[PDB]
Design a binder for this molecule. Structure first.
Ligand SMILES: [Ca+2]
Ligand SMILES: [Ca+2]
Ligand SMILES: [Zn+2]
Ligand SMILES: [Zn+2]
Length: 157
């Protein structure tokens, strides 16, 4: 399942109150950039209305038949390319969200979720971004591991 147009739109529907609105927007922006530098896809922010990729923070039962589970465990989930819920990414509102090494770094989590949003499945490489379990990595000069580049190149490359 892959997107048919190169220019995709996204919307942040709501926020977490543990970080400034600036810092949530920056984490989402930089997460999309990681995939933009390794594919033809171009990502455009909208403020209101219906975008290709809806981003939201939600708790327990939230309308999609995949409920969240409260503190820790499942951190987020994203749907594959398609109409409607296709491509949308949901983040567990009950987590502590950070811009640091402390559980859990919103940039790193969103980076992984957006891979799903674009057609990727999980990787068996423990050093990949698309590995099933969360692991902190120094974020200052973060770029995608080579495994994830191979991933998006096989789809859109
Ligand atoms: Ca959780
Ligand atoms: Ca969508
Ligand atoms: Zn959901
Ligand atoms: Zn995943």
């Amino acid at each position: 399942p892959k997107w048919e147009r190169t220019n995709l739109t996204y919307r942040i529907r709501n926020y977490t109150p543990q970080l400034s609105e600036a810092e949530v927007e920056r984490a989402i922006k930089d997460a999309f950039e990681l995939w933009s530098v390794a594919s033809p896809l171009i990502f455009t922010r909208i403020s209101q209305g219906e975008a290709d990729i809806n981003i939201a923070f939600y708790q327990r039962d939230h309308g999609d038949n995949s409920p969240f589970d409260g503190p820790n465990g499942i951190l987020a989930h994203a749907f594959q390319p398609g109409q409607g819920i296709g491509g949308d990414a949901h983040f567990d509102a009950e987590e502590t969200w950070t811009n640091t090494s402390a559980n859990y770094n919103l940039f790193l989590v969103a980076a992984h979720e957006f891979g799903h949003s674009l057609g990727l499945a999980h990787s068996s490489d423990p050093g990949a971004l698309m590995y099933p379990n969360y692991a902190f990595r120094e974020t200052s000069n973060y770029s995608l591991p080579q495994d994830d580049i191979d991933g998006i190149q096989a789809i859109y490359g």
